[PDB]
Amino acid sequence: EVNLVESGGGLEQSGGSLSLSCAASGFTFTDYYMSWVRQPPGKALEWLALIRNKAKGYTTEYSASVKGRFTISRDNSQSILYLQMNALRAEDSAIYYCARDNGAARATFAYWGQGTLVTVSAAKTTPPSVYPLAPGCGDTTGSSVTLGCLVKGYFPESVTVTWNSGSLSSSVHTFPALLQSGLYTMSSSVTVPSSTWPSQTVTCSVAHPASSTTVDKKLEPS
Amino acid sequence: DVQITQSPSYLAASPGETITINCRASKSIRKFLAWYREKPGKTNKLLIYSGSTLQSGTPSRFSGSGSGTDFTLTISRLEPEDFAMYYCQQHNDYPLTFGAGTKLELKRADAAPTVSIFPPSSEQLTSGGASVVCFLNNFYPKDINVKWKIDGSERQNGVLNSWTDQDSKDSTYSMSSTLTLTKDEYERHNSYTCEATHKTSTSPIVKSFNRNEC
């Protein structure tokens, strides 16, 4: 029943500071070594910092890679681990994980959280534009029709796309987001039977929590 | 710092089969290498530590060995939950350091992509932009090339290609290719083509539209 829950990630500009938290439960916090490890979008895992247990006096170790900019600490009464991040830069953008050792090999990571996403950028919180992708112009054949939605110009990550449908089983592909012109674009497709379309409604529902936006776009023929 | 070189970066296999991953450290780490599994939606799982010791919860079909610089992980009799990303990590010295990863993907039969092209939507044209989209859906293996042409001339700038992770259900890949133009450029040209080249055929699969048709 060990759980680790990171929070505090979000969008910051270069130059400032951010602090992350990791809420630990399901074990005796003070008995274990706790660490932060990060993973950028395209890259390797990168260990950042470790803080030892009560038996070792809660001493620390750090990766020299971040040039002293991060400080690890623990609130033992509340079972919370912290990472203070100073002098933020764009290259700090990553998912940040907290981790706990296995009780024997004190420099291994037996338990991890799901992580919290940190984005350091000049780009501003921006809602997506959602455009329907449907057949209408040129050919129209086949027993299956492919539909989609283009989700363009949002920031920061992430968005979720949900298709309805209902009863029909369909088939959905959610394409990972990419930066272009300083903002994210992603897309999503679904395939429905020609026997259903266009008389039955198909909608892509696009949620962007950062901007508090949800767009329900109905797919209509061209 | 200890640099660790993990190979291969990619493996394909099926349930019941065996694969091996190697990890080589730039200097001795004694016996202290650990292995992890990463999967979208799950938290990372410690499999083995100290080169050969199984972490609680790891099935006996995982085997690790080595000492000094050269280590190996073997997973025998593979199960569905084993198709995932793997990393090694030395735990001999600070800083703690990782291999770059191995993606163990599920083998399936080769399949050509289902290719669909979409003009800019009226909605986008109204907002003042214009993107042409091509989906290359449900193909295997992952490698594929897409080529855009406008009025028969190949276009490279302004193209965003995004691949799905391997499909949970049918073990294929899909890729979305979006060619972002401007409203004025879109209106200057009539023919738009996307051409997919995949190992399943010497011939590209071509989809096109012409604005003079509709």
């Binding site: 030892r52 070792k56 004190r106 420099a107 | 202290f32 735990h91 001999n92 703690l96």
Partner: peptide
């Protein structure tokens, strides 16, 4: 009892 870095 030596399990690596500590």
């Amino acid at each position: 009892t030596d399990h690596g870095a500590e």
